[PDB]
Curated annotation (Swiss-Prot), chain A:
Protein task: Acts as a component of the translation initiation factor 2B (eIF2B) complex, which catalyzes the exchange of GDP for GTP on the eukaryotic initiation factor 2 (eIF2) complex gamma subunit. Its guanine nucleotide exchange factor activity is repressed when bound to eIF2 complex phosphorylated on the alpha subunit, thereby limiting the amount of methionyl-initiator methionine tRNA available to the ribosome and consequently global translation is repressed.
Organism: Saccharomyces cerevisiae (strain ATCC 204508 / S288c)
Name of the protein this chain belongs to: Translation initiation factor eIF2B subunit alpha
Pfam families, per the entry: IF-2B (PF01008)
Keyword terms, alphabetized: Acetylation, Activator, Cytoplasm, Initiation factor, Phosphoprotein, Protein biosynthesis, Repressor, Translation regulation
Compartments (UniProt record): Cytoplasm, Cytosol
GO molecular function, one term: enzyme regulator activity
Miscellaneous comment in the UniProt entry for this protein: Present with 8970 molecules/cell in log phase SD medium.
Complex and partners: Component of the translation initiation factor 2B (eIF2B) complex which is a heterodecamer of two sets of five different subunits: alpha, beta, gamma, delta and epsilon. Subunits alpha, beta and delta comprise a regulatory subcomplex and subunits epsilon and gamma comprise a catalytic subcomplex. Within the complex, the hexameric regulatory complex resides at the center, with the two heterodimeric catalytic subcomplexes bound on opposite sides.
Phosphothreonine modifications at: 288
Curated annotation (Swiss-Prot), chain B:
Signal sequence annotation: none
KW Protein biosynthesis (keyword) present: yes
Region (Disordered): 328-355
Other observations noted: Present with 10300 molecules/cell in log phase SD medium.
UniProt record similarity statement: Belongs to the eIF-2B alpha/beta/delta subunits family.
Top-level taxon of the source organism: Eukaryota
Location relative to the cell: Cytoplasm, Cytosol
Protein name, entry field: Translation initiation factor eIF2B subunit delta
A cellular component term, taken from the record's GO annotations: eukaryotic translation initiation factor 2B complex
Single GO MF descriptor: enzyme regulator activity
Ranges of compositional bias, category Basic and acidic residues: 342-352
Keywords: Acetylation, Cytoplasm, Initiation factor, Phosphoprotein, Protein biosynthesis, Repressor, Translation regulation
BP terms from Gene Ontology: cytoplasmic translational initiation; regulation of translational initiation
Swiss-Prot record, chain C:
Location (main, coarse): cytoplasm
Highest rank taxon of the organism: Eukaryota
Gene giving rise to this polypeptide: SUI2
Domain S1 motif residue range list: 15-83
Pfam family, any one: S1
Effect of residue 50 to D: Weakly impairs derepression of GCN4 expression in amino acid-starved cells
Keywords assigned: Cytoplasm, Initiation factor, Phosphoprotein, Protein biosynthesis, RNA-binding
MF-aspect GO terms: ribosome binding; RNA binding; translation initiation factor activity
SMART domains assigned to the protein according to its UniProt record, in alphabetical order: S1 (SM00316)
Protein name: Eukaryotic translation initiation factor 2 subunit alpha
Length: 302, 355, 246
């Protein structure tokens, strides 16, 4: 039946339901065919499927997080010691239900956790997340004075795309190169960031350049913020400054070429330390300091 | 009754709160004490090998031995003077060398056990089950935990490593040994030594006994050793309710150095070492010893040279004091390897309420 | 070599009880080997394992009691549970495991001696012993007491059987300082010899008698030695002499 095929489903559309939610839905669909009553025939197979997915991954992180969350949920489910049928039914229900939940979570975020930008606070946004964009758009519906500063993102010209999405709402914007980012911290009030995943230590797994930005923020004492939908907690520990389980090469020194072929292999994923975060905006309450770790502990009971 | 007063050397002006004095050579004591405790105390007082991890285990073993040897009196019940005996033992231990957090925990556990079984059961049936239970506990919360930690470390280590290490922490020795033997990677071990206890030297010896490529350095020589070198590992004693690293001597400086030179530090700890006691400096409560440790002029421990110094009491206004336990900064260590695989040091008491 | 099922059927049923020896735990549950219904691994879940510290008790090697939930009698998928198991079943399953182990031990020496496959031996044994009698160990015991179970099917090997019998039939050192001052002594000694063996008796010196007591399971040797001592004491009291036991 395949999960990979399901994933390759949405591409040109999307821009609505969270990825980690689509994956979960796919998993649920995979499950509800081959009888979820037996645990021997099913859980192992699910694990195998997840492994296969991991193997097949081009450049994605949150899938693993989603799958482990799903597993945890499943584990939680069969603690009621009632009957196999009803529980199974409930589990089945909880896939589409989970998807439904995401929208509600988003709504909650966009109505409650938008109070940071109010008195014409100039925002420095980097790292594309849907939640942040929703917050921005929903903030323009309340007619509140605000201003936007865009740092140029270069994986495959995503910055341009970002600037194209802000033009639909009709809001003044300017482009800044991530080299002159050190020069401009004066008029810009606060730094906001969209993350790919949140680490076990507390730190942020992100894109082409974030650590430097964090450092700059620290230097300037202008606070650093991360806004994400609360399902990006992976069992991963970046122990050193330049280490992550990455699909791409971690700083590969290419041999002496002549025709200018091997050059664009720069770090497309960067990590920042736990101390840099001032506020983390999530749907499961306004929590930051060591909240992710606590959540993880609660999940693993260890 | 024991022994009181008479302390060698100057008392100094600063850092006066904890015991630093005492019996080194035994003279007149109570005629009821089991000698194994005394022997242990004698060992601990003049020990150069132990470091946080094995001490508690040793204590547990001693307790087990005592239990095995224990015989209930015909008149009084199993717990009547036993508590008094325990108290006396504790007092002796304190006199010799102050109690650790692990030791405190062990004591608490013992107390709990005592409360659990009320005086009604016969002798040979109760202690048979007690000793087994204690053994099981030991197997569970210590050795297995250590194994788990080791395995976690195994997956965490990448390819091509150059590591700087410190301490006589048994876990670290186990780790390094494991790396050397069963992993067969490109591991390089650099050792740092300290003046109060020759822990670094011991570590080096252990490495040699396995057959590892070893660089040997000190606290002073650090500016040239980096000039390729990445990982830094330390041995922790206990983590407090604040989250600060309450450990042995030369760690904090090393950590700071590591922080300065790009690459962060990783520290290992057990899931029982956590404390409810609140402190944020070394001044609060510190392991202070006699200035006899800082007498030998380099090279080796047993040399005895008549060089320049060899007086403390006769010297007018002279304070020769050294500290053993230190409080390292919170933000500097990033990695903590505990019972729950991986986590940050800012968690502090997440396992304390969990029990 | 350890393989093949202990009972008649390959796969278990519903409600029937089993024993698992856990190698590694904590991911989904434990996909570990069984020591009751074949050495092929079955799976327990982390849902019906906690009844009332959970990651410390089991871990590696320690015996854990299990009960079969769901069986897929087609390809090979076995579901197991720990929470459904009561305190009464604990000893029972352990006992069963022990029995299985004993059976395995019994069918290993044979394999070694005649240099023949173990599976074939198992096949030839487990039909009038595991189906009609009950368990195999008990059947063996019955045979040893009075031969009736082995007579059902013709044995291809007799030497192996003989060896097994011999095995069924640890040396502990015992020294008795015999220092008699009696009128008739030799006869008494002979009598003693005739009762103590029915084990290994060796003579080095005239007053010293060396004997090594055979033990079945280590602790059983204390009961026999004492009996022997008692017999010795009985021996010389009537005649008029003394025997000292260290």
């Amino acid at each position: 039946f395949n999960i990979t095929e399901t994933y390759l489903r949405f591409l040109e559309e999307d821009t609505e339901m969270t990825m980690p939610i689509a994956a979960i839905e796919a998993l649920v669909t995979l499950l509800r065919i081959k009888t979820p009553e037996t645990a021997a025939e099913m859980i192992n197979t699910i694990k195998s499927s997840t492994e296969e997915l991991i193997k097949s991954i081009p450049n994605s992180v949150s899938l693993r997080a989603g799958c482990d969350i799903f597993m945890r949920f499943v584990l939680r489910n069969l603690h009621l010691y009632g009957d196999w049928e009803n529980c199974k039914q409930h589990l089945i229900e909880n896939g589409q239900l989970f998807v439904s939940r995401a929208k509600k979570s988003r709504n909650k975020i966009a109505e409650i956790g938008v109070d940071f930008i109010a008195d014409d606070d100039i925002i420095l946004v980097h790292g594309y997340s849907r939640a942040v964009f929703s917050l921005l758009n929903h903030a323009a519906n309340k007619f509140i004075r605000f201003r936007c500063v865009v740092t140029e993102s270069r994986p495959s010209k995503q910055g341009n795309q970002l600037y194209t999405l802000l033009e639909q709402k009709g809001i003044p914007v300017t482009l800044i190169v991530d080299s002159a980012v050190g020069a401009v911290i004066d008029k810009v009030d606060k730094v906001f960031v969209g993350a790919e995943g949140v680490a076990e230590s507390g730190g942020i797994i992100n894109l082409v350049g974030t650590y430097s930005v964090g450092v700059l923020a620290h230097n300037a004492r202008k606070p650093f913020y991360v806004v994400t939908e609360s399902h990006k907690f992976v069992r991963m520990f970046p122990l050193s400054s330049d280490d992550l389980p990455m699909a791409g090469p971690p700083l590969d020194f290419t041999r002496r070429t002549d025709d200018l072929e091997d050059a664009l292999r720069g770090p497309t994923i960067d990590y920042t330390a736990q101390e840099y975060i001032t506020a983390l905006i999530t749907d499961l309450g306004v929590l930051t300091p060591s909240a992710v770790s606590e959540e993880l502990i609660k999940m693993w009971y260890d | 009754p024991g022994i009181s007063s008479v302390i060698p050397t100057v008392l100094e002006q600063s850092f006066d709160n904890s015991s630093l004095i005492s019996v080194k050579e035994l003279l007149l004591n109570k005629d009821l004490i089991h000698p194994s405790i005394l022997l242990l105390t004698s060992h601990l007082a003049h020990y150069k090998i132990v470091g946080s991890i094995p001490r508690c285990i040793a204590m547990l073993e001693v307790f087990q031995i005592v239990i095995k040897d224990y015989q209930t009196p015909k008149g009084t019940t199993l717990s009547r003077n036993l508590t008094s005996y325990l108290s006396h033992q504790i007092d002796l231990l304190k006199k010799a060398r102050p109690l650790s957090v692990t030791m405190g925990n062990a004591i608490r556990w013992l107390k709990q056990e005592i409360s659990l079984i009320d005086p009604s059961t016969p002798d040979k049936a109760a202690k048979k089950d007690l000793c087994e239970k204690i053994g099981q506990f030991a197997k569970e919360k210590i050795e297995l935990a250590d194994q788990l930690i080791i395995d976690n470390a195994s997956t965490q280590i990448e390819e091509s490593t150059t590591i700087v290490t410190y301490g006589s922490s048994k876990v670290l020795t186990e780790l390094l040994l494991h790396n050397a033997i069963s992993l067969k990677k490109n591991i390089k071990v650099i050792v740092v030594d300290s003046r109060p206890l020759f822990e670094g030297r011991k570590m080096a010896e252990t490495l040699r006994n396995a057959g590892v490529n070893v660089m040997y350095a000190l606290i002073t020589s650090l500016d040239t050793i980096f000039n390729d070198v990445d990982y830094v590992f330390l041995g922790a004693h206990s983590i407090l309710s604040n989250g600060f690293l309450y450990s042995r001597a030369g760690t904090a400086m090393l950590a700071m150095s590591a922080k300065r030179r790009n690459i962060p530090v990783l520290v290992c700890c057990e899931s029982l070492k956590f404390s409810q006691r609140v402190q944020l400096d070394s001044v609060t409560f510190n392991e202070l010893a006699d200035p006899n440790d800082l007498v030998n002029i380099d090279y080796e421990n047993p040399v005895e040279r008549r060089g320049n110094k060899g007086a403390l009491l006769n010297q007018f206004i002279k304070e020769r004091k050294f500290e053993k336990k230190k409080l390292a900064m919170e933000n500097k260590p990033k990695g903590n390897k505990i019972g729950g695989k991986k986590g940050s040091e800012g968690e502090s008491k997440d396992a304390s309420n969990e029990e | 070599t350890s393989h093949c099922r202990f009972y008649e059927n390959k796969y278990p049923e519903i409600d029937d009880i089993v024993m698992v020896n856990v190698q590694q735990i904590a991911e989904m549950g434990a996909y570990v080997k069984l020591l009751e219904y074949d050495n092929i691994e079955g799976m327990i879940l982390l849902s019906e394992l906690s009844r009332r510290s959970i990651q410390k008790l089991i871990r590696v090697g320690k015996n854990d009691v299990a009960v079969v939930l769901r069986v897929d009698k087609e390809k090979g998928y076995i579901d197991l549970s720990k929470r459904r198991v009561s305190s009464e079943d604990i000893i029972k399953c352990e006992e069963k495991y022990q029995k299985s182990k004993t059976v395995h031990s019994i069918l290993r020496y044979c394999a070694e001696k005649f240099q023949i496959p173990l599976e074939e031996l198992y096949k030839t044994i487990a039909w009038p012993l595991s189906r009609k009698f009950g368990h195999a160990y008990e059947a063996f015991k019955l045979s040893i007491i009075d031969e009736t179970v082995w007579e059902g099917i013709e044995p291809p090997s007799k030497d192996v059987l003989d060896e097994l019998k011999n095995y069924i039939s640890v040396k502990i050192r015992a020294d008795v300082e015999v220092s008699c001052f009696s009128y008739e002594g030799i006869d008494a000694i002979k009598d003693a010899l005739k009762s103590a063996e029915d084990v290994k008796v060796k003579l080095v010196a005239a007053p010293l008698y060396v004997l090594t007591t055979q033990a079945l399971d280590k602790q059983k040797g204390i009961e026999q030695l004492e009996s022997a001592i008692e017999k010795i004491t009985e021996v010389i009291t009537k005649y008029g002499g003394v025997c000292n036991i260290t």
